[PDB]
Design a protein around this nucleic acid. Structure first.
Lengths: 77, 77, 77, 74, 66, 65, 92
RNA sequence: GUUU
């Protein structure tokens, strides 16, 4: 059932936490039970700690498939 | 005359059990139930992190501990 | 030929296993199963490749093996 | 018996720890045999509820099953 | 199975676990899934004394004698 | 998708830890367990083994050189 | 079985693949399997730094478990098809 | 029991 309440927000904006301080915001195109995802119009935020200081990087993409095994969390922004 | 592990876990039901993850963290509580996958139900768990060790939390009620991460079970704490 | 078939017929040979933790295991293979779990006799395990415990028999889970060096003899044996 | 638990606490307020340490407090909307969890009115904290609130999701929160270390009631 | 654990009942075995744990105990029980029942269990992390422990077989990495 | 076209050919292998190998691919199964011969360390150009068996869990990439 | 179906319609289309260990690779998708393993023909370098130690290699096999991302173009994919198909899929 |  939590995987059905995810269909609920297909074509709706979603927020996705991944392993490694990565974050994705995109519009939900497809998923499976493995949590594999496709997002359109997405921007990915990477929080890195180098030289003991915190920076966050960005990456934009019009269409992306996300291997589901790194996926930790899904909500809306 | 074989001693079966799951029979040992069955006997420690309603007793105090220590549950050690494969990480540092440990859970001590009253063993309510368990399944075939060794998922585990604890009652009023003390959650620990191990080396000075800081006690993370005192649970109240019932916890389902995923047996996916469990390395060791100690009967009667 | 398949890695598993190769192993099944290397039974009685000497071989060197590298585990996912870095430990090296030199021994003579005595049994393999379909998940590449091994049992070896005349064993010597090392903490790392730099090198020393001698053991009579060891059982190794297959999911823990990075690679297995075979004896050059292998193809004809 | 673990399934009886899953249906016994639906609608109750739970803490769901993940592998990383991160902890989610919400109301249990739904659960699945793969340990996948749905929560509503969820907050994230690191390790303990008493620590600094890192996020408050007004929306529903889907937590992946492979990642959950426990689900606990309060 | 490929390892006959019966010959190890009432002997002292060494069991390395996933996540880098070591456990030496006396083998009291076993299952087909490699779940063990150890007695006089000492977990090496340098020394920790648990007693009668159940080891999960899914996380077991290696098993030797002692 | 299959490693069939690579049999007996030389290959580059990138491991998940970013380590690099050069070898002749001789056998493979469905889990990507490889049987390799005349293996070398790409970076190191150091001869590793005349025959070696490599778990699929370790592989990230195999390339046809 | 759904993402296998997805990746089949992408054959002959240039894709970028990001592997967990920070390796990025441009290539023509030649082949896909049940594990989502990928075979890429005519290999090329997207990033200077991330790109690994190759050269002559023009054909690669990528293990599906090790990919994080597959970067696509919005014209390679019918969104409504994807959505209605996800809606159809059963997860139990 | 290696690709969720």
């Amino acid at each position: 059932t939590p995987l059905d309440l995810l269909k609920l927000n297909l074509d709706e904006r979603v927020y996705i936490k991944l392993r490694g301080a990565r974050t994705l915001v995109g519009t939900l195109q497809a998923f499976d039970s493995h949590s594999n995802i496709v997002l359109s119009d997405a921007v990915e935020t990477i929080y890195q700690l180098n030289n003991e200081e915190l920076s966050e990087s960005e990456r934009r993409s019009e269409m992306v498939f996300i291997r589901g095994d790194t996926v930790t969390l899904i909500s809306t922004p | 005359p074989e001693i079966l592990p799951l029979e040992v876990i069955d006997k420690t039901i309603n007793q105090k059990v220590l549950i050690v993850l494969q990480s540092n963290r440990e859970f001590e509580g009253t063993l309510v139930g368990f399944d075939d996958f060794v998922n585990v139900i604890l009652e009023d768990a003390v959650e620990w992190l191990i080396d000075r060790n800081e006690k993370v939390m005192q649970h109240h009620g019932r916890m389902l501990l995923s047996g996916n991460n469990i390395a060791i079970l100690v009967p009667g704490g | 030929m398949l890695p598993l078939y190769l192993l099944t017929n290397a039974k009685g040979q000497q071989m060197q296993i590298e585990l996912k933790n870095g430990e090296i295991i030199q021994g003579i293979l005595t049994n393999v199963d379909n998940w590449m779990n091994l049992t070896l006799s005349n064993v010597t395990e090392y903490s790392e490749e730099s090198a020393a415990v001698k053991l009579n028999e060891i059982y190794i889970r297959g999911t823990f093996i990075k690679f297995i060096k075979l004896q050059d003899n292998i193809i004809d044996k | 018996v673990t399934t009886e638990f899953l249906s016994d606490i639906i609608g109750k307020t739970v803490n769901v720890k993940l592998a990383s340490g991160l902890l989610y407090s919400g109301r249990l909307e739904s659960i699945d045999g793969f340990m996948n969890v749905a929560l509503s009115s969820a907050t994230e904290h690191y390790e303990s509820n008493n620590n600094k609130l890192l996020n408050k999701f007004n929306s529903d929160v889907f937590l992946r099953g492979t990642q959950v270390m426990y689900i606990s009631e309060q | 199975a490929i390892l006959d654990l019966a010959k190890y009942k009432d002997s002292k075995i060494r069991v390395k676990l996933m996540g880098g744990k070591l456990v030496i105990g006396v083998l009291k029980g076993y299952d087909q899934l490699m779940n063990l029942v150890l007695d006089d269990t000492v977990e090496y992390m340098n020394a920790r004394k648990l007693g009668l422990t159940v080891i999960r077989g899914t996380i077991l990495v290696s098993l030797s004698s002692a | 998708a299959t490693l069939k076209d690579y049999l007996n050919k030389r290959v580059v292998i990138i491991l998940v830890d970013g380590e690099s190998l050069i070898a002749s691919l001789n056998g493979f199964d469905k889990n990507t367990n490889l049987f390799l011969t005349n293996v070398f360390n790409r970076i190191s150009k150091e001869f590793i083994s005349k025959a070696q068996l490599l778990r699929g869990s370790e592989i990230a990439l195999v390339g046809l050189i | 079985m759904l993402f296998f179906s997805f990746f089949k319609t992408l054959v002959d289309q240039e894709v970028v693949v990001e592997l967990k260990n920070d390796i990025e690779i441009k290539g023509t998708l030649q082949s896909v399997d049940q594990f989502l393993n990928l075979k890429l023909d005519n290999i090329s370098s997207t990033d200077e730094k991330k790109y690994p130690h190759l050269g002559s290699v023009r054909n690669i096999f990528i293990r599906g478990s090790t990919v994080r991302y597959v970067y696509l173009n919005k014209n390679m994919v019918d969104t409504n098809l994807l959505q209605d198909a996800t809606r159809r899929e059963v997860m139990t």
